[PDB]
Amino acid sequence: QVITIGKHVKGYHYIIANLGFTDGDLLKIQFGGAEVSGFQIVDYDDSLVS
Amino acid sequence: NSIQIGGLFPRGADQEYSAFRVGMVQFSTSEFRLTPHIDNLEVANSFAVTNAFCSQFSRGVYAIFGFYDKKSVNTITSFCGTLHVSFITPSFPTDGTHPFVIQMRPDLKGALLSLIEYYQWDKFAYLYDSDRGLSTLQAVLDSAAEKKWQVTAINVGNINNDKKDETYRSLFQDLELKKERRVILDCERDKVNDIVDQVITIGKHVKGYHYIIANLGFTDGDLLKIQFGGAEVSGFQIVDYDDSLVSKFIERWSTLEEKEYPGAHTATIKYTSALTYDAVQVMTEAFRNLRKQRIEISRRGNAGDCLANPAVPWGQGVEIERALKQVQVEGLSGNIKFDQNGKRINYTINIMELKTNGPRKIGYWSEVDKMVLTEDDTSGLEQKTVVVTTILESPYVMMKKNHEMLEGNERYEGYCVDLAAEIAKHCGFKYKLTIVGDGKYGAR
């Protein structure tokens, strides 16, 4: 609904409050203009993870 | 009289071919009938055009119908002038005035150059694809040279699909080198549906941008995802849905079976499909008139070789074409008339601009009467000039010496005249300077 009204442009900023910040669709607003930041409890670069 | 006709469809035009069959259901009359030699074949290979053309010549059909390619437009003109075979197309308009060539798509350029001037533009980009022809592209640069316009033209359709993600990101940054706000798009509806998604991907649908779609089915694509974007997108309709004859057909169209007619169990229709349905209305009227004229078309279907040297023509098809251009009926495109070349006249296209409710009409453009807006003042809020009362006083309110040539708030000068701007500067309103009647300051 944000990208519907186009509020992903430069000047906006968004913060997601969970641990799987990378779980949802981040791709459609990857090139939006705003800045979206979050967290990981899980690092994918670990051996035991990989 | 079931008459040998010829029909060549590009593979995929099934809604049109359904709408062809609807007009075949609708406009087939009692006495004379049609022998549809349907050719659902590709349009790219002119050899494949050729063998299918010589097939119906070997069939000796009395009319050929269907679409054509820009690669095959010089092919079919090289034969319809040659073999004297009257062909009818709904596809894009031709350039050269060719005989035995009938076309159903009206021109767009006269309304469009009106619309730019109606929007009163000076500088804009212009994306386009070569595959539809370039006569519009050639035409606009002429007026742009005349109207000193600064036009950026970029062909886009030769980009492959396999990289059709980053080329655009490369592309619109190049438009942001000049930071463009005014874009005219002229491609396919699907190409529009390709590119509009990439715009909303990078979010260039916000306020400040403006887009113009160069087709007749401006309302065909997804307008919904950018209905609430911020930019302004405007276009045209050859087909007005509010007509009775239209709405009757909509009741017929939507009630069709999707399996019995693919792509027909829908609310609205392609305007291409409308010209298909309009053509048979003409095409029955054509064979209607030669029986009213009592003209026999009694010629064999054994027309010989198309490579007969020389292939002898037959002048009844001259008279067939002669009776075509006198046809004036009412269809989904409305009133239709021809020139001496089969090119359409006496047509009128409306202007449709996407709004919050959706698309809406503001005006038309007749074929000769230019862009006349049709006037619906739905602006329920309009910023009223407020009433500023005062009285003539040096140095507060003094008449300008040339108040006669001047007008309104300019005729009044003095100290307070400066101040009235400042509050209007600060409080943003509009106003009108008015004078007290009796010339008194005021007492009970």
Add this chain to the structure above:
Amino acid sequence: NAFCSQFSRGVYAIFGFYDKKSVNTITSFCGTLHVSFITPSFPTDGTHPFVIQMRPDLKGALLSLIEYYQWDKFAYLYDSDRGLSTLQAVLDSAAEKK
């Protein structure tokens, strides 16, 4: 008819000129009938098989020459009858080179 004549002759190579109205014709047959054709006329656009051409391209030298003359603004008269690929090509660089 002249093409099908030499096909009826079954000649081993066809040679000569062509039109911009017939360029889509001959490509629609040399790809089809697999007949190697050679032209000296203007260069083609699509990479077509069985199509041999003798005229080299002009656009790479010409865009060099404008930059060699270091230009910014100019008129450009042209005729459609030779093709328009040069016209399409220059507007791309003109958009790039403002």
